[PDB]
């Protein structure tokens, strides 16, 4: 089956009866809750539907809370939408107004203070483009240079204007508190600029009394300048290509994507590739040739996971988008699971051992590689290598199963906390033998460590036949 | 500047005054004339505008005639378009009718004879999908399973039905005769199935008294099964992804593309990647993130050329599409021009020498590699290696400059037919010194051969400083 | 700390008091008893001296019995010796006689049947050389082409002649029986031609009720033609260069040596390089520059062990020969222990695991690699890789310590037969902690297997700090 | 034919009529005249014999003058010789005396100033070894620790002692002047310590009005410390292993040899390996197995040339030594000519071009590589790569044929000084067609350069069939 993981975004198109369940059955590995839209009622109902579907199907499904961050947005228009045609003059004001075609509010109250004639304003990830002609009091008077539809609350980007805004707003802190209390498994922070942004997220977590893994969304030039330090400081990264391709020239995104995936893999951190991967499937039952190519290539690049956004959250074909994505991933994988080589030989005990375990398993034609992990680290150091063999994570901590839902090629088994590596190995046999897929005599390579129940203790590789007396 | 080449398709959107010139100035290297649409009048006018723009600007621009081949199409509808909604019953008839929503003709008169209940019909490259429920006389009665707009003369595909049709129709033969007489530089054949299809094109050429290079369009499973024999028999290939992704499962196209590019390069034949590369730019001023990725990745795969279809032929932003494609190509190339390694060390004289010349030029930091070529072969064997150095083809045959417009990284200089390699080398200096960018003393590596004026005689590498007495 | 092993031959020069002890202290790893000379009382006394010296010093010292094999010899002369000068005619007869200058017997009773005019006869491996002129009945009439002294019972070689003789003589069977009863640790058979020769050695061993490892001496063209089959069938090989360079052209020996070493290593069998390595030290206190080169190059080639023959058995400087050999080996090793790479990836469990263990130990900067072995196999699969790390073999079978005396880079510890791998690991700590050079906390990589006490069960790698609670 | 070159030393054993001729016919490529022995009449006679044999046979044979250098020696003894037995006390004095057993002079007048108790004195490269006990005025009082015969004027070594002495003695200057006037083709300087030593040799040469290539003999630790600077400053190097293995611990010589060969090859300088390669052939018709190994391994190491000293100058088997050496070299080469890879990609024009020429010739299965060279450089840059193809140097300067006698794999053809590269190529055909080995149509790769007759102008590679009109 499929090795690469699929992240789907929930929203209006997944709220109908049984759709969340249908996404899980179709292969969704991680459900994204985007706090840019919806209210707390919405997110709670959707969270519950994911947990139910996961427990009903037996599939691991992680829940990712995506914080909106310092997003700049337009306000509302009188009819909900308008058309900004090339050549029209429009006013974006930092004051109060009822929006109309001619004049609309913005959430960024420093716009009129900071804008200068010549500044570019890109709406909705570049659908519409304006240029500032002047500032008159609270109004930024613009000419539409590239025309298109605009609608209530659309995002704007001010590339090459330094935005001043806190990494977490008050809304983000409330959303994060709600999400932590609700029980989500990971958190993604939009518009990360610095490795120190993770410290702000940790502050909230520690006050509330609950940490979960933090994903840095990469969608700002500062993020790319600080890429390595960000990969090191956060638990995972997302190539957030929508905003990244307005904040940077869109032609620079493909090589940035590949750099970011490679860096994540070298550091054994999960990487998600996001946004417009199957964009046309918002309206169409089949994707474009560029879209299938983009999905295939993100697999070949070495991504742990690929994300669907509007394709599942608002589109007409959410289930078909998941199925289509999965078909493309599998077609590539069937040819080969190889990723680009890592440029450093592993140095850490866990890396050295996971690398050796892969060697042994492949050369002896084992049926699976099995790794015990308390934090996920030992398994992540193996997963990033890619192997055509099944990779079976064993843990005692249920949250680790949901966290590993985003890690390449990995399925997780929850077992009791054991007091010995012999016990760990017995648990492997018990768990695997309950599956139709495994039988007595099957060769597996098991990575474990003593002292038991200690992060980082990984220190043994055992070649084992299931149920046989070889321990 | 840019190494990878850009093919643009001409049509209604390029017919406005001086748009063809504007495409040339924006970087179009090859203009595609698609004989599926337009009048002979239209193609003549467009051909002339390309020749004028090429001579006015001094840029080489090849002209490629694309023959429609055994395309199956719907006929016309009463108002020019209709909507086929999911659940509707429609009739595709092999008999005469004015089309309406309910019933429309097809050009494939064997449809009712060859269709069986359960056969799938995909319209317009998969935008609409039908299933055959029965055949009643001349009518194939279908249910729309995936709905969408359809319009006059849209193509249909019958994947998993053996289509019987000649590789060249009467219309194709007329079009090819017209194109050869008009003076086009290359010909592309749609729906190639066999290496022997090239000999049918050669038959027409030889009767008319004029050969030009033949490109096999790859858009049938048979073509991919016979890929190597087709690359060997034709002069070039096009990955025609529109039809290929209906004739094959769309998820199989990305690896096919990569295989086809590699095979072309191993055999020193040009390869063009076509269709939907910047599809959304038909309506939008900026492409999707999948589209920029697809363009970048086709560069990384090693393609000589990338093609725009509707983006230039019918779309709202033909100039922007060319500029955008060029920006993406350049962004990748600025990072590196490396292509995947060839799997064979060169064994032919021309291959061995072009490979050596590249070594010498790169290791001595030469300002350019220069190769004399009568057929293009010596230059193509170098081009396929990729090198960050300029690659300057010298020839006495003007058509070779237009043909090499589709070959990676290559600019061509027309010079007189010379009687010695010393004379060839003097012509290099004369030609290059007329350019602002070259001066006396500049180090160049020159590949040439005696006997002069003989295809394949390539047998010398000379390291030369322009204008210096070192020959 | 020298890794490569040294084999020394006992004889008249080692019989004087305390010399055998001094050899052991100087580094002798294996003592060779050459059954071509000496009586049973001699060999018994020498055997006892080796066992005492080994037990007194604590150093493992293997005892190797070298069987003479089907050696062809001259008979006796009336005056005990004569001079065969260039130009003289001599008769070698298959009849019995007391010899004279003109006519002497040979032990090879088929000489007159098998020799033809033009055959070469080399005496004493090539001081005296004759050419056969004719066969008259029992007499092979020869012309001396290179003159010199000959004496009773000197060996002769018939290079190029197909010699028909049993692999074991009656004398060999008696000698082997005496050596097995005496308690020697391995046996070498001279003049091996076929893999089936080992079967005759095994027959004797099984009748006597004691097997030990069998080394094939390689000194016949047939042996080299059947090299792989012989390496597979025997337990080890010796490049017996003295006779090899008479039976084959001497100029072919260096590449044969290198081939044989590589083959032994690919199959995890010990290889000894023998004969004339420091030949001039029979008379001189320091070797020639060719000799030092020969020793260094045998190390670089990947030999487990190097042998001294006359340098220790009859020479004036037996101790200095051993010390000098050791200094040369250590000088090379101090630069690098690298051997030529093996040409295939390990395929067996023991090979795959020993290869992984090496990776882990080197990458984690372990103080030693430790491997449990019942037959030696697991340790031999590691030894042949070469590693700058100490390689510590652990076993319960004392003979394995003596056998592994000829294996590259390996020291062996005898411990009790254990009932668990945890027990094995505890024995490692107990044994190592008794050494000054290991301490608590030292990192080691341990290879072991369950079920315990079973050849081939090797199935675990444990990274362990000595005395720490990490099992 | 043989690729590696053989240097032989002339002396008493080659003085008998027609022996020098027989050496040339047996394959001697370079004749060494050792100015440590013989008078000027001897050297003149031997020089004449080499020139006659070279011209009569048509084989290039270089003549190498080896200067004695700052060799330290004993003085004379009253009885011409004495025996210095282990245990006795001897005085080596810096004062003049006719010696006796108890007290003998030395030529090194700083011995008493520079020696200290504990210093070793080795006579004759270490048959006799003394240890210094005391310095009393002019006398160095020593204890003999290894006994043996000593005689008038025997050499001594003071390993570890900093010897202060001029690089050229007055005798060396006289010898060098005689050798230059006589017409020798290159000069070797013994006991080189510094790159600046070449400057003193050049001083003499410039005063006399004749330069030839200078070879640094490497036989002092200072030389090895300054190895790269010495290789760069001199025209070639000789690994002078006799003295090197006394001045340095003999166990360090094998890796020094290999380092020196590699360094010479990286810098395209000839390297000769010297001394005791077939030492036992001074008395014996066949060498030891160590000796054959030493010769083979010097070939595999990448040496241009191997040298015979006493084996040809004083031994009983000078011709057999040469033939035996040649058979061993050829046996290795028949298997493969591969040398260790160079660690740098070639950077100079001549290196880059010679490397490319090799590629082309091997890939196109050319019959030979041909290179024009005025100084030897272009050919040396190719030779050091090793190729199984013939390497044919073409030059107009007769001395270059004698100089290239010591360069790996190279035969040299003298042709007129040409005014064009076309003329050079015609000379190739004329010269080669006179050989039985080459015929019209044979494919060769030719390296040449314009401006003609200029060192370093190498700038063209031409693939040519002999006698065909392809230039
Ligand atoms: N124990 C011994 N007694 C008498 N002579 C010996 C003995 N060992 C070796 N020799 C002789 O001394 C010479 C050199 O010894 P060598 O290096 O050949 O050891 P060896 O080859 O194992 O002995 P051998 O060749 O006789 O089997 C040979 O002539 C050999 O016959
Ligand atoms: N079920 C379990 N019982 C005991 N220890 C476990 C269990 N699962 C994982 N571990 C520990 O987790 C370690 C690896 O953790 P990590 O460094 O986060 O990969 C192993 O060495 C085990 O000791
Ligand atoms: N301008 C020219 N004059 C003479 N010969 C040419 C010219 N241009 C190319 N050639 C020949 O074309 C050969 C290479 O042709 P091709 O094999 O098609 O690459 C060279 O070896 C030249 O002999
Ligand atoms: N002291 C010992 N106690 C128990 N088993 C041992 C001991 N030493 C070696 N072994 C066994 O020998 C096996 C390796 O043997 P071999 O395949 O011959 O290298 C290991 O798997 C161990 O089970
Ligand atoms: N017979 C010759 N006639 C003219 N030039 C020669 C001849 N032989 C060698 N050369 C020159 O020697 C150059 C290479 O010399 P070098 O750099 O010393 O190897 C070539 O470029 C030629 O120009
Ligand atoms: O937030 C995102 O996912 C983006 O911008 O692409
Ligand atoms: O023909 C084409 O270009 C296609 O099908 O994409
Ligand atoms: O038997 C031997 O040792 C030999 O011949 O070298
Ligand atoms: O000078 C030499 O030839 C030596 O010392 O080896
Ligand atoms: K968000
Ligand atoms: K023997
Ligand atoms: K000398
Ligand atoms: Mg978005
Ligand atoms: Mg974003
Ligand atoms: Mg199309
Ligand atoms: Mg098509
Ligand atoms: Mg023997
Ligand atoms: Mg010397």
Rounded CA gap, B386 and B381, in Å?
Answer: 10
**Paired residues of C65 in beta bridges:** C33, C187
Q: Summarize the annotated binding site of A as residue ranges.
A: 32, 34-37, 66, 73, 154, 219, 242-243, 275
Nearest to B332, CA basis, from B306, B300, B308: B300
Rounded CA gap, B167 and B38, in Å?
Answer: 21
Rounded CA gap, B457 and D416, in Å?
Answer: 29
Rounded CA gap, D460 and A24, in Å?
Answer: 68
Question: For residue A300, what are the contacts with CB-CB under 8 A and spacing of at least 6?
Answer: A332, A339
Question: For residue D136, what are the contacts with CB-CB under 8 A and spacing of at least 6?
Answer: none
Residue C164, burial from CB neighbour count under 10 angstroms (0-12, 13-18, 19+): exposed
User: For B404-430, b where at least 16 C-beta lie within 10 A, e where not — what string?
Assistant: bbbbbbbebbbbeebeebbebbebbbe
Angle at A330 between CA A324 and CA A334, to 5 degrees: 150
Tokens 């009643």 sit at which residue?
Answer: B136
Distances (CA, A) of B422 to B94, B364, B462, D451: 66, 22, 10, 14
Cβ separation of B459 and D459 shorter than 8 Å? no
B15 CA to middle of ligand 7, Å? Answer: 21
Facing residue for D461 by CB, picked from B364, B460, B469: B460
Coil, strand, or helix at residue C468? coil
Contact B445, B461 (CB under 8 A): yes
Instruction: Specify the CATH number of the domain A2-69+167-332.
Output: 3.20.20.60
Chain centroid offset of residue C466 CA = 35
Backbone angles phi, psi at D370, to 5 degrees: -125, 130
Catalytic entry in B217, B258, B265, B358: B217
Rounded CA gap, D431 and D446, in Å?
Answer: 13
Rounded CA gap, A450 and C425, in Å?
Answer: 14
Ligand 3 contact via B458 beta carbon (within 6 Å): yes
Rounded CA gap, C393 and C401, in Å?
Answer: 8
Enumerate neighbours of A (3 or more CB pairs within 8 A).
Answer: B, C
Which two tokens mark A98?
């009822």
Catalytic entry in B9, B14, B275, B395: B275
Query: Going by beta carbons, is chain B in contact with chain D, meaning 3 or more pairs sit under 8 Å apart?
Result: yes
Contact B273, B254 (CB under 8 A): no
Rounded CA gap, A278 and B117, in Å?
Answer: 32
Contact B158, B119 (CB under 8 A): yes
Question: For residue A171, what are the contacts with CB-CB under 8 A and spacing of at least 6?
Answer: A35, A68
Interface list for chain A against chain C, based on CB atoms closer than 8 Å: 345-347, 349, 352-353, 355-356, 359-360, 363-364, 421, 449-451, 457, 459-464, 469-471
Distances (CA, A) of C389 to B394, B446, C4, C384, C461: 61, 54, 13, 13, 16
Which two tokens mark D361?
């010739």
Instruction: Tell me: cis bond preceding B331? Omega within 30 of 0 counts.
Output: no
Instruction: Judge whether A275 counts as a catalytic residue.
Output: yes
Pocket test residue of B383, B448, B451, B461 for ligand 3, highest count of atoms within 8 A of CB: B448
Facing residue for A459 by CB, picked from C359, C363, C462: C462
Rounded CA gap, A349 and B279, in Å?
Answer: 49
User: How many CB atoms lie under 10 A from the CB of residue C153?
Assistant: 12
Residue A47, burial from CB neighbour count under 10 angstroms (0-12, 13-18, 19+): buried
Which two tokens mark B244?
């290929």
Quote the longest CA-to-CA distance of chain D: 83
Report the helix count and the strand count for chain A, using DSSP H and E: 16, 21
Contacts of C254 in chain D (CB under 8 A): 292-293, 295-297, 328, 331-332
Helix axes D289-301, C289-301, angle to 10 degrees: 70
Instruction: Judge whether B275 counts as a catalytic residue.
Output: yes
Rounded CA gap, D93 and D340, in Å?
Answer: 49
The alpha-carbon radius of gyration of chain C (Å, integer) is 24
Q: Note the residue count of chain C.
A: 471
**Paired residues of A464 in beta bridges:** A444
| Alpha-carbon dihedral sign for residues B367, B370, B376, B381 | negative
Nearest to D410, CA basis, from D426, D430, D389, D428: D389
How does DSSP assign D282-320, residue by residue? GT-SS--HHHHHHHHHHHHHT-SEEEESHHHHT-S-HHH
Angle at C233 between CA C227 and CA C239, to 5 degrees: 45
Angle at D349 between CA D348 and CA D350, to 5 degrees: 90
The CA-based dihedral angle spanning residues C313, C318, C324, C328, taken in that order and rounded to the nearest 10 degrees = 10
**Paired residues of B364 in beta bridges:** none
Instruction: Judge whether D323 counts as a catalytic residue.
Output: no
Residue D219 labeled ligand binder = yes
Q: Summarize the annotated binding site of C for substrate as residue ranges.
A: 32, 242-243, 275
Helix (H) or strand (E) holding D33: strand D30-34
Contact A64, A185 (CB under 8 A): yes
Rounded CA gap, A351 and A470, in Å?
Answer: 26
**Paired residues of D411 in beta bridges:** D392
Tokens 């030989």 sit at which residue?
Answer: A345
| Alpha-carbon dihedral sign for residues B324, B326, B329, B333 | negative
Nearest to C115, CA basis, from C129, C134, C97: C134
| Alpha-carbon dihedral sign for residues A184, A188, A194, A197 | negative
Rounded CA gap, C397 and C386, in Å?
Answer: 24
Rounded CA gap, B287 and A280, in Å?
Answer: 12
Rounded CA gap, C105 and C78, in Å?
Answer: 11
Coil, strand, or helix at residue D194? coil
Contact D168, D128 (CB under 8 A): no
Ligand 7 contact via B190 beta carbon (within 6 Å): yes
Nearest to B290, CA basis, from A329, A280, A217: A280
Rounded CA gap, D379 and D407, in Å?
Answer: 9
Backbone angles phi, psi at A384, to 5 degrees: -65, -15
Helix axes D318-335, D19-26, angle to 10 degrees: 10
Coil, strand, or helix at residue C42? helix
Backbone angles phi, psi at A273, to 5 degrees: -100, 125
Nearest to C107, CA basis, from C134, C149, C70, C136: C70
Interface test with A, best of C355, C360, C426 (most A CBs within 10 A): C360
Contact A403, A186 (CB under 8 A): yes
Residue D284 labeled ligand binder = no
User: What DSSP character marks residue D443?
Assistant: E
Nearest to B27, CA basis, from B236, B251, B323: B323
Contacts of C294 in chain D (CB under 8 A): 289-291, 293-294, 297
Question: For residue C265, what are the contacts with CB-CB under 8 A and spacing of at least 6?
Answer: C271, C302, C339, C342, C384
Contacts of D245 in chain C (CB under 8 A): 289, 292
Q: Summarize the annotated binding site of A for ATP as residue ranges.
A: 34-37, 73, 154
Rounded CA gap, B186 and B455, in Å?
Answer: 19
Contact C250, C333 (CB under 8 A): no
Contacts of D224 in chain C (CB under 8 A): none
Contact A394, A373 (CB under 8 A): yes
Coil, strand, or helix at residue A249? coil
Contact C416, C443 (CB under 8 A): no
The alpha-carbon radius of gyration of chain A (Å, integer) is 24
Rounded CA gap, D185 and D174, in Å?
Answer: 17
Backbone angles phi, psi at C63, to 5 degrees: -115, 120
Chain centroid offset of residue A191 CA = 14
Residue nearest ligand 6's atom 2 by CA = A240
Query: Going by beta carbons, is chain A in contact with chain C, meaning 3 or more pairs sit under 8 Å apart?
Result: yes
Facing residue for D451 by CB, picked from B355, B460, B469: B469
Nearest chain C Cα distance for residue D383, angstroms:
23
SS (H, E, C) chain B: CCCCEEEEECCHHHCCCCHHHHHHHHCCCEEEEECCCCCHHHHHHHHHHHHHHHHHHCCCCEEEEEECCCCCEECCECCCEEEECCCCEEEEECCCCCECCCEEEECCCCHHHHCCCCCEEEECCCCEEEEEEEEECCEEEEEEEECEEEECCCEEECCCCCCCCCCCCHHHHHHHHHHHHHCCCEEEECCCCCCCHHHHHHHHHHHHCCCCCEEEEECCHHHHHCHHHHHHHCCEEEEEHHHHHHHCCHHHHHHHHHHHHHHHHHCCCCEEEECCCCHHHHCCCCCCHHHHHHHHHHHHHCCCEEEECHHHHCCCCHHHHHHHHHHHHHHHHHHCCCCCCCCCCCCCHHHHHHHHHHHHHHHCCCCEEEEECCCCHHHHHHHCCCCCCCEEEEECCHHHHHHHHHCCCEEEEECCCCCCHHHHHHHHHHHHHCCCCCCCCCEEEEEEECCCCCCCCEEEEEEEECCCCCC
Residue C280 has, within 13 A of its CA and on its CB side, a CA count of 25
Residues of chain C with CATH 3.20.20.60: 2-69+167-332
Distances (CA, A) of D295 to B456, D246, D336: 46, 21, 15
Chain centroid offset of residue C311 CA = 15
Residue C356, burial from CB neighbour count under 10 angstroms (0-12, 13-18, 19+): buried
Contact A368, A392 (CB under 8 A): yes
Question: For residue B23, what are the contacts with CB-CB under 8 A and spacing of at least 6?
Answer: B8, B14, B31, B53, B312, B318, B319, B322
The alpha-carbon radius of gyration of chain B (Å, integer) is 24
How does DSSP assign A209-232, residue by residue? T----EEEEE-SHHHHHTHHHHHH
Which two tokens mark B418?
């010379």
Contact D393, D402 (CB under 8 A): no
Helix axes D253-266, D289-301, angle to 10 degrees: 30
What was the resolution (in A) of this experimentally determined structure? 1.9
Instruction: Judge whether C76 counts as a catalytic residue.
Output: no
Facing residue for A288 by CB, picked from B255, B279, B289: B279
Nearest to A468, CA basis, from C448, C420, C451, C417: C451
Tokens 């080394």 sit at which residue?
Answer: C215
Contact D90, D102 (CB under 8 A): yes
Helix (H) or strand (E) holding A371: strand A368-372
Question: For residue A460, what are the contacts with CB-CB under 8 A and spacing of at least 6?
Answer: A421, A447, A448, A449, A450, C460, C461, C462, C463
Contact D414, D401 (CB under 8 A): yes
A33 CA to middle of ligand 6, Å? Answer: 13
How does DSSP assign D213-267, residue by residue? -EEEEE-SHHHHHTHHHHHHHSSEEEEEHHHHHHHS-GGGHHHHHHHHHHHHHHT
Q: Summarize the annotated binding site of A for substrate as residue ranges.
A: 32, 242-243, 275
Nearest chain A Cα distance for residue B288, angstroms:
6
Helix (H) or strand (E) holding A145: strand A139-146
User: How many CB atoms lie under 10 A from the CB of residue C455?
Assistant: 13
Ligand 8 contact via C217 beta carbon (within 6 Å): yes
**Paired residues of A273 in beta bridges:** A239, A306
Question: For residue C440, what are the contacts with CB-CB under 8 A and spacing of at least 6?
Answer: C433, C465, C466, C467, C468
Facing residue for D251 by CB, picked from C127, C298, C327: C327
Rounded CA gap, C358 and B46, in Å?
Answer: 70
Cβ separation of A294 and B293 shorter than 8 Å? yes
Rounded CA gap, C55 and C65, in Å?
Answer: 20
Q: What was the structure determination method?
A: X-ray
């Amino acid at each position: 089956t499929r090795r690469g993981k699929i992240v789907c975004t929930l929203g209006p198109a997944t709220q109908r009866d049984d759709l969340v369940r249908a996404l899980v059955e179709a292969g969704m590995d991680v459900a994204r809750m985007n706090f840019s839209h919806g209210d707390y009622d919405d997110h709670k109902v959707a969270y519950e539907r994911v947990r139910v579907a996961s427990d009903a199907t037996g599939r691991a499904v992680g829940v990712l809370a995506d914080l909106q961050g310092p997003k700049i947005r337009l306000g509302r228009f009188a009819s909900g939408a308008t058309h900004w045609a090339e050549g029209e003059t429009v006013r974006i004001t930092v004051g109060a107004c009822e929006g109309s075609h001619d004049r609309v509010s913005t959430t960024y109250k420093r716009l009129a203070q900071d804008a200068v004639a010549g500044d570019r304003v890109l709406v909705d990830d570049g659908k519409v483009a304006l240029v500032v002609d002047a500032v008159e009091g609270d109004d930024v008077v613009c000419t539409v240079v590239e025309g298109g539809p605009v609608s209530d609350n659309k995002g704007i980007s001010l590339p090459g204007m330094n935005v001043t805004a806190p990494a977490l707003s008050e809304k983000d802190i409330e959303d994060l508190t709600f999400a932590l209390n609700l029980g989500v498994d990971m958190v993604a922070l939009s518009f990360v600029r610095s490795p120190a942004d993770v410290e702000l997220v940790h502050e909230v977590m520690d006050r509330i009394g609950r940490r979960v893994p933090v994903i840095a969304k990469l969608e700002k030039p500062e993020a790319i300048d600080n890429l390595e330090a960000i990969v090191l400081a956060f638990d995972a990264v997302m190539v957030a290509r929508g905003d990244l391709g307005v904040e940077l020239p869109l032609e620079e995104v493909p090589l940035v994507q590949k750099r970011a995936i490679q860096m994540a893999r070298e550091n054994a951190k999960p990487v998600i590739v996001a946004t417009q991967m199957l964009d046309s499937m918002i309206e169409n039952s089949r994707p474009t040739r560029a879209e299938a190519s983009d999905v295939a290539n993100a697999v070949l690049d070495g991504a742990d996971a690929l994300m669907l956004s509007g394709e599942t959250s608002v589109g007409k074909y959410p289930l078909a988008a998941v199925r289509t994505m999965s078909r493309i991933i599998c077609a590539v994988e069937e040819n080969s699971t190889a990723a680009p080589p890592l440029t450093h030989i592993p140095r850490t005990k866990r890396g050295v051992i996971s690398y050796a375990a892969r060697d042994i398993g492949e050369r002896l034609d084992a049926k699976a590689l099995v790794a015990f992990t308390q934090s996920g680290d030992t398994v992540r150091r193996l997963a990033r290598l890619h192997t055509p063999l099944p990779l079976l994570a064993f843990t005692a901590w249920p949250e680790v199963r949901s966290q590993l839902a985003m890690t390449w090629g990995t399925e997780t088994f929850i077992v009791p906390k054991m007091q010995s590596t012999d016990g760990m190995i017995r648990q492997v046999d018990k768990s695997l033998l309950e599956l139709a897929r495994y039988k007595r005599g099957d060769l597996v390579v098991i990575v474990a460590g003593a002292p038991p129940g200690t992060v980082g203790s990984t220190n043994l590789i055992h070649v084992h036949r299931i149920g046989e007396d070889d321990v």
